[PDB]
Write an enzyme that holds these catalytic residues in place. Structure first.
Site, PDB file in Angstrom:
ATOM      1  CG  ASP A 156       1.030 -82.511  23.002  1.00  0.00           C
ATOM      2  OD1 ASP A 156       1.366 -83.623  22.533  1.00  0.00           O
ATOM      3  OD2 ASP A 156       1.139 -82.221  24.212  1.00  0.00           O
ATOM      4  N   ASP A 184      10.025 -72.400  24.137  1.00  0.00           N
ATOM      5  CA  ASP A 184      11.484 -72.384  24.137  1.00  0.00           C
ATOM      6  C   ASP A 184      12.034 -72.435  25.553  1.00  0.00           C
TER       7      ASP A 184
END
Ligand SMILES: Cc1ccnc(Oc2ccc(-c3cc(O[C@H]4CCC[C@@H](N)C4)c4c(C)n[nH]c4c3)c(Cl)c2)n1
Ligand SMILES: [Ca+2]
Ligand SMILES: [Ca+2]
Ligand SMILES: [Ca+2]
Length: 312
Positions: free
Chosen positions: A154, A181
């Site tokens: 990222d 998650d």
């Protein structure tokens, strides 16, 4: 690798950080007093806080997540790997804990903020300054992959932090799949191969760096490419789904001609090659002409930063 070698000042600052970190102990929620907000991003809000017992200033990211105790304990255990990630180009780690429905991640405080915040104040960031940023990002991505087998995944201006000592460090690199998650973040900086399902590698982070460098150099997110009227106003509305289709299906952006050196233009060109196999790797970028010129350049990044954002 010689890029992971540390200067004497870097080694002293890393040792000083580890020495102050050993005196901290187990972090608890009631031991923190809020000072100010550093910004939101990547699934939570970051606050500049004071750890009352040790007196240290920290950055505290709070991720509101309603999870069972078991889920929280795996995340806190998975985040323990950050104790081993110590590099002059990676923000330092203090601890992680859970309290009243919020995961807290406490890290080193960079008093210059993130480069997306610096860019808003500066308008455009000079090429010589972006040379120092490129060196730091490359060495940070190298350290993460070489010493921990970690991809950042990222890279973007808001995930590059700077401080008044001239240091440039990366942040918000995933280490916990459970936290990923459980959260279930913009994709405008993702490589065209990640946007197409083809699996990720460090080459994807190199694309993101090249795109971030172009945005900071021109002062705008470079997709769609600017018109000639926008350029004459800069040097003298697509939705998100349309933008991601543009990244995959159209040629990559590039720096304008005449206002940046050809070595800088060639550097970001080799970062933004759409084919991940032809795109340069970290080892090749480390010896690129732009990087070798920048390392020899003696740029007072701290002096430029403090006067640009008015730290004084
Ligand atoms: C390595 C890792 C793995 C998993 N999770 C986390 O969680 C984090 C991530 C980042 C920070 C963080 C953010 C900071 O500014 C934000 C402002 C808004 C935009 C944001 N992109 C940056 C700062 C500043 C200025 N100084 N120190 C900071 C530390 C923290 Cl504390 C915890 N990290
Ligand atoms: Ca609290
Ligand atoms: Ca409390
Ligand atoms: Ca994250």
């Amino acid at each position: 690798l010689e890029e992971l070698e540390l200067d004497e000042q870097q080694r002293k600052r890393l040792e000083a950080f580890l020495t102050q970190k050993q005196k901290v102990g187990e972090l608890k929620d009631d031991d923190f007093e809020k000072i100010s907000e550093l910004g939101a991003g990547n699934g939570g809000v970051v606050f500049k806080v004071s750890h009352k017992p040790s007196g240290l200033v920290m950055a505290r990211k709070l991720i509101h997540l309603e999870i069972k105790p078991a889920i929280r304990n795996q995340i806190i255990r998975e985040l323990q790997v950050l104790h081993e990630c110590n590099s002059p180009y990676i923000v330092g780690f203090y601890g992680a804990f859970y309290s009243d429905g919020e995961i807290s991640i406490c890290m080193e405080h960079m008093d210059g903020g993130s480069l997306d915040q610096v860019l808003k104040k500066a308008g455009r960031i000079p090429e010589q300054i972006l040379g120092k940023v490129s060196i730091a990002v490359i060495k940070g991505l190298t350290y993460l992959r070489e010493k921990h087998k970690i991809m950042h995944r990222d890279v973007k201006p808001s995930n590059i932090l700077v401080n008044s000592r001239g240091e440039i460090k990366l942040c918000d690199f995933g280490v916990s799949g459970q936290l990923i998650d459980s959260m279930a973040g913009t994709r405008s900086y993702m490589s065209p191969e990640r946007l197409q399902g083809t699996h990720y590698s460090v080459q994807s982070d190199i694309w993101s760096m090249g795109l971030s460098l172009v945005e900071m150099a021109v002062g705008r997110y470079p997709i769609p490419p600017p018109d000639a009227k926008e350029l004459e106003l800069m040097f003298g509305p697509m939705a998100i789904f349309e933008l991601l289709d543009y990244i995959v299906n159209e040629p990559p952006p590039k720096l304008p001609s005449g206002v940046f050196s050809l070595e800088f233009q060639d550097f970001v060109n080799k970062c933004l090659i759409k084919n991940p196999a032809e795109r340069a790797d970290l080892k090749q970028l480390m010896v690129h002409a732009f990087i070798k010129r920048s390392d020899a350049e003696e740029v007072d990044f701290a002096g430029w930063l403090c006067s640009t954002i008015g730290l004084n």
